[PDB]
Design a protein around this nucleic acid. Structure first.
Lengths: 53, 102, 48, 117, 110, 141
RNA sequence: GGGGCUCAAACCACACACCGAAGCUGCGGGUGUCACGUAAGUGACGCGGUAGAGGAGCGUUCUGUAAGCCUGUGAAGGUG
RNA sequence: GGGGAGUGAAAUAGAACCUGAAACCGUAUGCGUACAAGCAGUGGGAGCCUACUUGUUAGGUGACUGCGUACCUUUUGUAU
C-alpha cells in the first residue's frame, strides 16, 4: 500500500515532533566530584563514596 | 464643515483640507476646477441637503498632481480550451487638495 | 546610405511565423493542422 | 547558430515564481505548481474586481437599512423617496453618514419621511 | 567573541545528527559536555569532539574561560552522500545512499 | 475608504427578552439579528458587533399549529443505527432551553463568527437570570 | 437548501416600493473598422471565443554595421 | 576534519578548488497557528512587528470573513 500523494514537509515534520530525545539523570559523587549516571557506577569506578572497581 | 461633491461619475465626502484621488480631469497642475455638483453641506449642526443640489454650487479646489495608479493585471484563461490572454492596466488619477467648495 | 541604414519597403519581407511556439502566437499546439486524421500526421498527404 | 536557453528560461521561471511568493508549500517553490497558482490567482483577481463592487454595495445597503430603522423607516422606504424627491446621494456616503455623522443622516431620513410616496 | 568548529563529513546522516544538536543548543558548555558524554548516540560522540574542539579554539586563539562559554549555534548540514548498490530479489538492484553531515558548533561568552 | 468596525472598540449592550408565549421562530429572527449586530449601522460582516441577549422563560416559548407534538429533533450519535429523535414537548420538558438555542443556532452563520455570535446568547429557564450585574434592559414588549 | 414559519415566512388575486448581472447608464482608458480631416482629430459603430484564416510584435544566439562604442573606477553571469 | 597564522589582488580561489542557479535540507529572526472542515487562492480586513517620516506611506505576517471542485490531453460533455 502506497501513497497517492507525497507527504508535505509540514506533515513530514509533524510526525517527528515526538522524536526529540530525553536527557539522562546525572548526578555528582560527593567524594570525587565527578558526574555520572544516577544509580550507576562512576566512569572511574566509584559508587556512593567508595571505590568498587 | 464637510461637503459631498460629484467629480468622476461618483461622489466623495470631502473635508476642508483633504488630499484625495479622483478620476482624471482635464486640467493642469496648480490650477482650479469647476463642477457645480455639491450635494450636501454640513457645518457643525447646520446641515444643508441638496433639493437636487445645494444651490450656489461650485467645485473649485486646487490640483496637487496628475498621477497613475498601481498596475492591476488581467488574466483570461479557459482551461482545456487552449486560450490564454493577459493585459496590464494603470488607472489615471488627479490628486486634488480641497480649498473651495460651494 | 549606411550599411546600418538599409531596409526594404514594407511588404517586401515578412516575418515567417513559426508554428507551435506557445498558445499566444496563434499557431499554438497544433500549428494550423487541427486534430486527428491523416492531414495532421507527418507525411500526412492525400495523393493528387 | 546554436542558442542555449538557460538564461531566458530561468528569468521566466523567476517571474512566475516571484508572483507566487507567499503561497503554501510547493505553490511557492516549484514551477509546475506555481505557474498554475499564479494563473489561478489572476483569474480570481479578475473575478473579484467585479465582486468588490458588489460586496461593498451590499454592505452600504445593510448599514443604511440598520441606520434607517433607528429612525423608524426601512431601507426600501428610504430609497423610495427619491423617484419623487431628489437627493441624488448614493449608498456609499449614506453608509458613511449612518456610522459617523449620525445627525446628518437623521436629517436625510426626515426629508424622506416628507416625501410619503 | 564567537568561535566555531566544523566537521565536514561525519558518517552519520544529518537527521540522526540534528536530534542531538537540538539537545545541546543554547546550553552552557560544561553541562553540554556532560550531556554528550552520557548519551547513547553516535552523534553525541561525534558532536562531543566538535564542541571539545570549539572550546579549545576559543581558549587558544582567544582568551576565553570554559565557564564563560555557551553553545551559541549548533547546526548540522547535509554532506556529500555516496551511492552504492544493495542487490534485491528477482534480479532488481536498489540504490543505497550513505549520507554524511556537516556539524558546526559555535561558542560565545554572552 | 469605507468604515470597517474594529473588534477592540465595539460597544455591546445587554438585553433580556421574555419568551412567555412568543412564537419560536419569530423570536429567533430578532435574537439572531441582534446577535450579529444587524440592528447597528456599524455592522461589519467579519466583526462581531452584536449584543448580548438573555432569554428568561425559555419553556413558555410556543410553536403554532400542531408543531407542539410534531417537530422532531434529530441527531446522529455516529454509530450505525444511531439516529435519535425528540419532539417539541418532551424536549421542552427535558432540557427546555436547547429548543430556543437550536433555533437561533441554525439562523446564525456556520462560521467561527457565528460560533462566537452564539456565545453571546444566554438562555435560562426561570423568571430570573444570573446576570443582574450587567444590567440587561428589556425589549420586544 | 437549512433554521424555522399557520389572520403566514403558504396559496389566490391587485396595488406600491425595493434588492439583484460583467445587462444598461455615468466617469477615466487603444486605435478595430469606416467616413471626414489640404491628413492632429474629431466623430460613428464595434471589441466572449475552439478548430481555423489574417495582421502586428518581443526576446535569445550568430554575421555585417564593428579596428566602432562600453568595460578592471569593474563585462557576461548570478541574486536582490 | 577544523580554529588561527602565513601566501596571494582575492582562500566564501585550499586542491571535490572559476562562476556557483534551481529543486532539496537547515539555523536565526518577525508575525500567524492547539473549538476548527474541502484546489489552499482571491475580495474585504483587525491586530502585531520592522524601517523610515508624518501617514491619507513602505516592507513582513494575515485573526476574522464573501466567493472559490488544480492542470494537460481527449471528448457531446471531466472536480472527475
Amino acid at each position: 500500500a502506497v501513497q497517492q500523494n507525497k507527504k508535505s514537509r509540514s506533515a513530514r515534520d509533524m510526525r517527528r515532533s515526538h522524536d526529540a530525545l530525553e536527557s539522562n539523570a546525572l548526578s555528582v559523587e560527593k567524594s570525587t566530584g565527578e558526574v555520572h549516571l544516577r544509580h550507576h557506577v562512576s566512569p572511574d569506578g566509584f559508587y556512593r563514596g567508595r571505590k568498587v572497581v | 464643515m464637510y461637503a459631498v461633491i460629484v467629480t468622476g461619475g461618483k461622489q466623495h465626502k470631502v473635508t476642508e483640507g483633504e488630499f484625495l484621488k479622483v478620476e482624471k480631469l482635464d486640467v493642469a497642475t496648480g490650477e482650479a476646477i469647476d463642477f457645480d455638483r455639491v450635494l450636501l453641506v454640513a457645518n457643525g449642526e447646520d446641515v444643508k441637503i441638496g433639493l437636487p443640489v445645494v444651490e450656489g454650487a461650485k467645485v473649485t479646489a486646487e490640483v496637487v498632481s496628475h498621477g497613475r495608479h498601481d498596475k492591476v493585471r488581467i488574466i483570461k484563461f479557459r482551461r482545456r480550451k487552449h486560450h490564454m490572454k493577459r493585459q496590464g492596466h494603470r488607472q489615471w488619477f488627479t490628486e486634488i487638495k480641497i480649498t473651495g467648495i460651494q | 546610405m549606411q550599411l546600418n541604414d538599409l531596409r526594404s519597403a514594407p511588404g517586401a519581407r515578412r516575418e515567417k511565423h513559426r508554428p507551435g511556439r506557445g498558445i499566444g502566437s496563434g499557431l499554438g499546439k497544433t500549428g494550423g493542422r487541427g486534430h486527428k486524421g491523416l492531414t495532421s500526421r507527418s507525411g500526412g498527404k492525400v495523393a493528387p | 547558430a546554436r542558442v542555449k536557453r538557460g538564461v531566458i528560461a530561468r528569468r521566466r521561471h523567476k517571474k512566475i515564481l516571484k508572483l507566487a511568493k507567499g503561497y503554501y508549500g510547493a505553490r511557492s517553490r516549484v514551477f509546475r505548481v506555481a505557474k498554475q497558482a499564479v494563473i489561478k490567482a489572476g483569474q480570481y483577481a479578475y473575478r473579484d474586481r467585479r465582486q468588490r463592487k458588489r460586496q461593498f454595495r451590499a454592505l452600504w445597503i445593510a448599514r443604511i437599512n440598520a441606520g434607517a430603522r433607528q429612525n423608524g423607516l426601512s431601507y426600501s422606504r428610504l430609497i423610495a423617496g427619491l423617484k419623487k424627491a431628489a437627493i441624488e446621494i448614493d449608498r456609499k456616503v449614506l453608509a458613511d453618514l449612518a456610522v459617523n455623522e449620525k445627525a446628518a443622516f437623521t436629517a436625510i431620513v426626515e426629508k424622506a419621511k416628507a416625501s410619503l410616496a | 567573541m564567537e568561535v566555531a568548529a566544523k566537521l565536514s563529513g561525519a558518517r552519520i546522516s544529518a537527521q540522526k545528527a540534528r536530534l542531538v544538536a537540538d539537545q545541546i543548543r543554547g546550553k552552557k558548555v560544561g553541562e553540554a559536555l556532560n550531556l554528550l558524554a552520557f548519551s547513547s548516540k553516535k552523534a553525541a560522540e561525534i558532536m562531543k569532539k566538535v564542541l571539545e574542539s570549539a572550546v579549545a579554539n576559543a581558549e587558544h586563539n582567544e582568551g576565553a574561560d570554559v565557564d564563560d562559554l555557551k553553545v551559541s549555534t549548533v547546526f548540522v548540514n547535509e554532506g556529500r552522500s555516496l551511492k552504492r548498490i544493495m542487490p534485491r530479489a528477482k534480479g532488481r538492484a536498489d540504490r543505497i545512499v550513505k549520507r554524511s553531515c556537516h556539524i558546526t558548533v559555535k561558542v560565545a561568552d554572552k | 475608504k469605507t468604515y470597517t468596525a474594529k473588534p477592540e472598540t465595539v460597544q455591546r449592550d445587554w438585553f433580556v427578552v421574555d419568551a412567555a408565549g412568543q412564537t419560536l421562530g419569530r423570536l429567533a429572527t430578532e435574537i439572531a439579528r441582534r446577535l450579529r449586530g444587524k440592528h447597528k449601522p456599524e455592522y461589519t460582516p467579519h466583526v462581531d458587533t452584536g449584543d448580548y441577549i438573555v432569554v428568561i422563560n425559555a419553556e413558555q416559548v410556543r410553536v403554532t399549529g400542531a408543531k407542539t407534538t410534531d417537530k422532531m429533533y434529530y441527531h446522529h450519535s455516529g454509530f450505525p443505527g444511531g439516529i435519535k429523535s425528540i419532539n417539541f414537548e418532551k424536549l421542552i420538558a427535558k432540557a427546555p432551553e436547547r429548543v430556543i438555542e437550536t433555533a437561533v443556532k441554525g439562523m446564525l452563520p456556520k462560521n467561527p463568527l457565528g460560533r462566537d455570535m452564539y456565545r453571546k446568547l444566554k438562555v435560562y429557564k426561570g423568571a430570573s437570570h444570573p446576570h443582574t450585574a450587567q444590567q440587561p434592559q428589556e425589549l420586544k414588549i
